[PDB]
Design a binder for this molecule. Sequence first.
Ligand SMILES: CC(C)[C@H](C(=O)O)[C@@H](O)C(=O)O
Ligand SMILES: CC(C)[C@H](C(=O)O)[C@@H](O)C(=O)O
Ligand SMILES: [Mn+2]
Ligand SMILES: [Mn+2]
Ligand SMILES: [Mn+2]
Ligand SMILES: [Mn+2]
Lengths: 346, 346
Amino acid sequence: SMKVAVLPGDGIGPEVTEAALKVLRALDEAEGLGLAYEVFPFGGAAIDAFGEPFPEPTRKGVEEAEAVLLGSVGGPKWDGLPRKIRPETGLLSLRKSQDLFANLRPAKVFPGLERLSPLKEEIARGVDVLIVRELTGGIYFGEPRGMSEAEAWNTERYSKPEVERVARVAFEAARKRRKHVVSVDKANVLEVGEFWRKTVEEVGRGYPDVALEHQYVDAMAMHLVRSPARFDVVVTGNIFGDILSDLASVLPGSLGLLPSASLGRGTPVFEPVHGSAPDIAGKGIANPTAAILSAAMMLEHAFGLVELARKVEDAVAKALLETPPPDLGGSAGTEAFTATVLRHLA
Amino acid sequence: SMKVAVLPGDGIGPEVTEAALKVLRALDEAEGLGLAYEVFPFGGAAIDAFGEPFPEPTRKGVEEAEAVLLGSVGGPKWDGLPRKIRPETGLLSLRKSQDLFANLRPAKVFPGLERLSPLKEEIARGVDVLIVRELTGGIYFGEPRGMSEAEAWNTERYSKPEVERVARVAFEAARKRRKHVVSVDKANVLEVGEFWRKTVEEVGRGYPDVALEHQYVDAMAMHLVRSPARFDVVVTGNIFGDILSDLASVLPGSLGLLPSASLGRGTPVFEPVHGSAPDIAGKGIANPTAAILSAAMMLEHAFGLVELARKVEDAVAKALLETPPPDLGGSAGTEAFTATVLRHLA
Ligand SMILES: CC(C)[C@H](C(=O)O)[C@@H](O)C(=O)O
Ligand SMILES: CC(C)[C@H](C(=O)O)[C@@H](O)C(=O)O
Ligand SMILES: [Mn+2]
Ligand SMILES: [Mn+2]
Ligand SMILES: [Mn+2]
Ligand SMILES: [Mn+2]
């Protein structure tokens, strides 16, 4: 079996999700995967239908599935909503309800595609970095939090077990990759950074076969641009991971390329890093690469189909070289780009 | 006249600071500026002699001077000491005591040097962005803050007057440049971001001639790499400013290229945005560009010597294209490079 909860969301979310659905359907037919999917409302669409971005039928659908394929959420239609029901809060609520504390974001420059990077070729070449981002803690969820007319406040905080568990995922991922972890904090300025580093260092003792290095977040942003090829796994807290993963997104040359996996205690979630791009929704141009590669991450991580995930990745890489979408200077529409991916899969 | 407190600091700090002083003496000679300056112990140097990084006599000198020319602080010798008594903390104390809420970091790619940028030439051409970072509030100084065996916490908080005063600096700076400001927050997840955005918006109304735009911090990190050329002034909080300013610093191709001004209630501070670079200390190769441009910002912001700051800057620019330092593919040591700047200043 292969039970998938599909949450298309808003803007280009449904378009890119349908592209990823075509890739999955074509694999189901060829490999006999027994895929069964069901579509649920989430985000702006759920707010308009149920009054909340992560409504009951959707929460039930997620908990009962083996994996979630997620689109994108948000748009100006919902600007000004009380924070508790913003599309963005529904997203945090999804991550939190399944306690998906480990967010995996791979930034990779495919061999031959250095041209597309905004960086000079020799710097972009061989880039293959995995950002492990702590997703259900830190300032995103910390209390106290609030605002009055005179001030506003949010609390960046971590407990020992929260740091331990995300650190352990980073070490396990590194062990399967190039056995190198860079942990990122602001320990020269903050107590939380200090605490972060101390705990990651302790977890590191359990993995003496993996090299551990620490970097300050400001210096890390800089390294991700000057020498990204020297990184294997990067582990950091919620907001630092949010920032650095968008920054890494530029290495391949575009934001519509980065897929992601959210793993923890409950139903794993797979979503393209990009937002809902309201400006281009329904215009048949959104690059579906991120969504497709997220479906690839789902195959590997949720279903253990490593070989299949790589076929998709290989097909996408050829499609990018052959007929790139407009965001990479090409003229291939969402539909045509997906068809290209399909031919290579054959 | 011109009363300056000089804080060389640790590592390359004294060398690069000395280089900047040679530029300053040259101008005091050629222009008769009435330059009076005294050297004070700061950072690790202050720790060795007084047992603290920011002792009473250095505090006194700072407060009696009209401007501070600071080198850099930190080094392996002082690792191990509690964070609270680090040279880096003495730097935070200096900033806090003079309530220098506005940190100006101009990341610029001088015409002809696009080649040194990690970015492709067309992207790096004409880059001229000023980061206005709030420097005395936010998480860096937020109460409550702490650590136990079980967890640690820090508080990202801003008051209305704190956001208003840094925002104003941003608008005034823009008004002198290209009339565009981008304010940067994480309003979609953080109450403090919503509060920041709302306050910058109200201040913005007093500047109907300046264009105002808001970007999320993760998207902004991306834009500083894909299209830095579209930005003029960028204003943001303490930690977001720390990250984006290091990011912007990579654009012209080195560390050694970025100066900064710290402006506020007390004595203004001018320092190069780079660490003590412990390894190359006393070897005479460190790029003094950032220290020299920092004294140039001093001339402008502390003494209103616009024209002179500019002559210093054009001189440095031609020195870079004529005799580049080791850190930018060249072989011009600290003193030889300074002499080139001296030669162009006449
Ligand atoms: C939409 C926003 C809340 C979200 C986040 O900050 O996690 C997005 O930026 C991302 O990175 O998935
Ligand atoms: C050394 C450190 C405390 C300092 C900061 O974080 O402000 C430095 O990174 C900077 O950007 O000037
Ligand atoms: Mn993000
Ligand atoms: Mn003259
Ligand atoms: Mn910094
Ligand atoms: Mn005072």
